[PDB]
Amino acid sequence: VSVLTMFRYAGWLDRLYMLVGTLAAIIHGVALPLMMLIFGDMTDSFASVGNVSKNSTNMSEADKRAMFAKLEEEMTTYAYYYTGIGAGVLIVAYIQVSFWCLAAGRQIHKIRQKFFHAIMNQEIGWFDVHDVGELNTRLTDDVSKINEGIGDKIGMFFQAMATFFGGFIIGFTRGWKLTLVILAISPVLGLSAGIWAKILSSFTDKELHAYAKAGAVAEEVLAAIRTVIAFGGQKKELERYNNNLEEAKRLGIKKAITANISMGAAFLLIYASYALAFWYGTSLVISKEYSIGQVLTVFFSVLIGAFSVGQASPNIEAFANARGAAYEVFKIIDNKPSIDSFSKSGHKPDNIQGNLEFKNIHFSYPSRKEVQILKGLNLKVKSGQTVALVGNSGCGKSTTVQLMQRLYDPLDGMVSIDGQDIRTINVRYLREIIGVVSQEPVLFATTIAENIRYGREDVTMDEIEKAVKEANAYDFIMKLPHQFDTLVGERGAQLSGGQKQRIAIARALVRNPKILLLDEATSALDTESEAVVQAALDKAREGRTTIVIAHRLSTVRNADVIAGFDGGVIVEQGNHDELMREKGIYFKLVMTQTLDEDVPPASFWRILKLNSTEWPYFVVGIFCAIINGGLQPAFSVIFSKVVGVFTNGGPPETQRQNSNLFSLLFLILGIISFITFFLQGFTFGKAGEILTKRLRYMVFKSMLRQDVSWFDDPKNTTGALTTRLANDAAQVKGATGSRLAVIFQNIANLGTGIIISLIYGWQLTLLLLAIVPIIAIAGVVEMKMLSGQALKDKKELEGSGKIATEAIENFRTVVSLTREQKFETMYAQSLQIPYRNAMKKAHVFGITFSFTQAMMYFSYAACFRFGAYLVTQQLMTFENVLLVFSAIVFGAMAVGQVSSFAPDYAKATVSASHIIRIIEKTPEIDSYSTQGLKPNMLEGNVQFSGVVFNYPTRPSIPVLQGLSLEVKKGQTLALVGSSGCGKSTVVQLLERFYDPMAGSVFLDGKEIKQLNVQWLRAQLGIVSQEPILFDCSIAENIAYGDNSRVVSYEEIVRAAKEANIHQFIDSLPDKYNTRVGDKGTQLSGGQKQRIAIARALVRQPHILLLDEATSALDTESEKVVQEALDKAREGRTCIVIAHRLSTIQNADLIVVIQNGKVKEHGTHQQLLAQKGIYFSMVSVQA
């Protein structure tokens, strides 16, 4: 595979830098065990000096002089080891970053410019395959990955290995026993982590299967939310959603449980291996002699080396992902896959004029989603003629024009322009002679001068002047401030669409074509702009060959030959009259034309407020983070005391202390950490669990208690709500997991470290905080400079992609052809600034990482440097020195955890905000109870007075304006409107989905405003235009149970008997108690609409609301439903809406509502005697 070789087109200096980066990376990684190699020689001599001090007990005069002089003489050489490596890691750092920038910069910039060229030079192919807009997003997002993949990540890979494999060499040579053991634990640790990954993967899918069910309930309810309201089953659908929530939590705790075993047992396996390494290391000294203390510290480096392999792995995956995404479309980048269509190199005779002769053309759909869409074609058009084409479709004329170009090639036939065919003619030349006036209005981001200037870059203002005057575009340019030089921002804002087309026409006048293909250039226009544009088209011909497609019979009257087509194959030819005489296509046309979510305020710890309210105890948990925090240094303290008694003293007692301490290194760490780790796991697990319940519960009830623009907006979509229930509840589990974790690292460095610092001699304390806050600050401040270059980089690429998205959204740019290379020139400069900036961040990023390694050696140097010196003369001990080194590594793990928890606090605050805004509510439907609860408080006499309505979307124009009606008890109020949508809205405002803005509605004198929600659906029944079932048994479907409804077998039988759906139910096994499949996808509309009626009469309505109860039905399906309605009705008030008149032919009071305004109203036979609006509608049925 070739992912940098051929990929970089084997660039000379690209290959050059690639070896230089590897070489500098080896020698960076080797150095790291080489520093610790130094720590071991320095450990040896000091022990040996100290050994001699303890064995004397008489000398301590001469020993105070010379032995310590020697340690100071070695210390100066040591200093130069640490410095020498220090200078080395600096230089070589800068080297590894150049790879990250300098190499990649000239490359991506090269890949991009040839890529952008290869799309225009392959013409059609790129446009065919996938979808532009979405296509150019992923690609500009992909080009940044390439930089990451050929960036220093490879260099970090080689570095990682140089520390592993290169370390292990020196470990292994200089002694083979401790190595053997250190390799022996490598598969045990790898076996365990492989069970881990299997547990993770398995339990995730299980959780998902649970939460799918909860999602599946959430999907249908929220989509169906108005419907679920209408039957009053809010509280029920809620109760089912709680069952699914019950399952998703029991799988929740087991996942948290098993995870806590993995994480616990993992630190156990670390501490075990670590103790076993040290123990076998000691048994070879005391009773034997195998280590002086040099190799022991180096074997510790072989343990650092394996941890490097684990850090390497993300670069490997970062590369895997860089490669795989680029390399698939790299195949498409290299070569032209269409060599059929090309923009470049041909040859023309230089033809003056062109007579089009089309001989035997047959061609298929360009996307091959239909085969053969032209059955033949013989067309001979000479110059001086105007041929008009007409059809049965608009598509087959567009096809001939697309073929006419070199955009597609005709499978059979050839179009001969002059003597030349369509492949002995040059592409560049083909375009210049071919004018196109298309229907879509030209888009541009720039001034009117530049827009002519894309036409030819050789155009003089004199030619600009004659152009616009002849295209009658010379009006608007004067009107606009700044004349021709007026900016048009966006993609049109200054100019209107008709004016856009005029400019394009003026643009073609500078081309001087001798072919014009006019595709609806005088259609889909106002009467005024048709006449203007027509004139321009008339003056642009002076004897040109043209082919005109229009839907205007006047322009097809001036064509010399009009040609009939069946939608792709020619049938008729001759003048206008000959066709009209045949009664052809031309004549056919003649007769045909005769809330606010993602606002700025954000959460300020409302997370822990909302969390704590629903928490009662678990204070032992919080306490456990503190003692498990402080548990971490002790492992190091014990370790310090180990090597301390291991160095000094003779053979008697040393074995016993090492054994004693070994058992202690186990019991204090391994045994306790597992216990306490699992207490903290029990706490943030059960917290994140019970939060998942309350949060999802208290949302879903709030969703039923609120209405209007919390799901009636296209950014509050149903899916978007379900997605919220997912992400927020998943997230809070990680939110609670981060708190105890932060307390753990707080005490772990700061807290205990101070306590450890007090038993120091406090020169060491001083020396230590000249390191720790600074190494921390170098790591946080690195991240602040990093992200600053990253922001500006994203910003740069915005402007470069933005002028790119203009070209690619236009397929029609290849038609000019000229402006392909002109655009890429403008790209080259636009892309030149981020290139130069890439060179700027090489030095900056170079220096940052350089200082970062500069602080590592500077730390170790000054640690041991100042750690000895004055101190050795007086009193100095092995202890406190590894505890300093431990405190150093504490400064690292702090930063690492904190930058990690920086986006957790973010995504949590956002989710905590979503949950707050929902609860704030807008409540027109909530729950209520205000009504008297008497069936004497209704007549069924619904008054409507000055009632206005407009959708929750405000620029929709009210469709009820000044409406007042009345309908008395036991009369059907029909409604019919040949304009508007004033039909459905009446039924809706009465259902109170959306409260009328003004006017009032009374149902007898009791206003809509004060109606209890519950009582409202106990006097109302609805038959929707879409009936929808829930996945539940059929008996629960015929009548759904509320808490105030009794459903019984006998009742739903009677219900099915009236509903005439009992026919199908009888034939289904078990009658009413059956369930088949899922939802209502098994059962036809007709069966379902019967079930919706059957649901209604449960509530015992006195007012029936029929939303299309006689539409979406045909033949018998209509009749059988109507029978079910007719029996359903007991002399009840009804609102029957639809524009179909069928059951309006017995409607007691027929109302013609025009746009909120009633025209005629009244009995059928009276209205039928009128010759007005109602009757006219009746006449036009016949």
Cβ contacts of residue 1037 below 8 Å, gap of 6+?
1029, 1030, 1091, 1095
Task: Please state the CATH superfamily assignment of the domain spanning residues 931-1182 in this structure.
Answer: P-loop containing nucleotide triphosphate hydrolases (3.40.50.300)
Hey, CA dihedral for 434, 440, 441, 445, is it positive or negative?
negative
**Residue whose tokens read 């006047």:** 554
Could you list the beta-strand ranges (E) of 496-623.
Answer: 515-519, 545-549, 561-565, 570-574
Hey, CA dihedral for 179, 181, 183, 185, is it positive or negative?
negative
**Residue whose tokens read 């620029």:** 955
**Residue whose tokens read 């040109």:** 544
Q: Which residues are annotated as a binding site?
A: 391-398, 977-984
Q: Are 262 and 210 in contact (CB under 8 A)?
A: no
Cβ contacts of residue 11 below 8 Å, gap of 6+?
106, 107
Q: Which residues are annotated as a binding site for ATP?
A: 391-398, 977-984
Hey, CA dihedral for 1152, 1156, 1157, 1158, is it positive or negative?
positive
Q: Are 596 and 402 in contact (CB under 8 A)?
A: no
Q: Which helix (H) or strand (E) holds 79?
A: helix 66-98
Q: β-pairing, 378-381 with 356-362?
A: antiparallel
**If we measure between CA atoms, which residue out of 1040, 1022, 1038, 1034 comes closest to residue 1134?**
1022
**If we measure between CA atoms, which residue out of 36, 12, 30, 326 comes closest to residue 163?**
30
Q: Which fold has domain 1-345+595-930?
A: ABC transporter transmembrane region fold (1.20.1560)
How many C-beta atoms surround the C-beta of residue 971 within 10 A? Answer: 17
**If we measure between CA atoms, which residue out of 529, 586, 60, 123 comes closest to residue 342?**
123
Three-state DSSP class for residue 316: helix
Cβ contacts of residue 979 below 8 Å, gap of 6+?
1154, 1155
**If we measure between CA atoms, which residue out of 634, 654, 632 comes closest to residue 644?**
654
Cβ-count burial of 1076 within 10 angstroms (0-12 exposed, 13-18 middle, 19+ buried)?
exposed
Q: Which helix (H) or strand (E) holds 788?
A: helix 772-808
Domain with CATH 3.40.50.300 in the chain: 346-594, 931-1182
**If we measure between CA atoms, which residue out of 525, 479, 485 comes closest to residue 501?**
525
**Token output for 132:** 């532009």
For the domain spanning 346-594, the CATH number is 3.40.50.300
Give residues after which the chain gaps, C-N over 2.5 angstroms.
594
CA distances from 185 to 182, 189, 197, 266 (A): 6, 6, 19, 13
Which residues sit opposite 1107 in a β-bridge?
A: 1137
d(CA 251, CA 209): 10
**If we measure between CA atoms, which residue out of 482, 410, 408 comes closest to residue 447?**
482
Cβ contacts of residue 704 below 8 Å, gap of 6+?
228, 229, 234, 235, 237, 238
**Apex 738 CA angle, 732 and 744, nearest 5:** 155
How many C-beta atoms surround the C-beta of residue 819 within 10 A? Answer: 21
- Per the rule left: phi > 0, alpha: psi between -120 and 50, beta: everything else, 512 is left
- Per the rule left: phi > 0, alpha: psi between -120 and 50, beta: everything else, 295 is alpha
Cβ contacts of residue 1046 below 8 Å, gap of 6+?
none
Q: Which helix (H) or strand (E) holds 966?
A: strand 960-967
Cβ contacts of residue 268 below 8 Å, gap of 6+?
670, 673, 674
d(CA 785, CA 774): 16
d(CA 1180, CA 1175): 9
d(CA 1062, CA 1054): 9
CA distances from 324 to 157, 694, 1063 (A): 18, 42, 59
Cβ-count burial of 901 within 10 angstroms (0-12 exposed, 13-18 middle, 19+ buried)?
middle
How many C-beta atoms surround the C-beta of residue 1048 within 10 A? Answer: 10
Q: β-pairing, 386-389 with 1020-1023?
A: unpaired
* DSSP codes joined into one string, 335-364: S-S-SSS-SS-------SS--EEEEEEEB-
Q: Which helix (H) or strand (E) holds 754?
A: helix 752-758
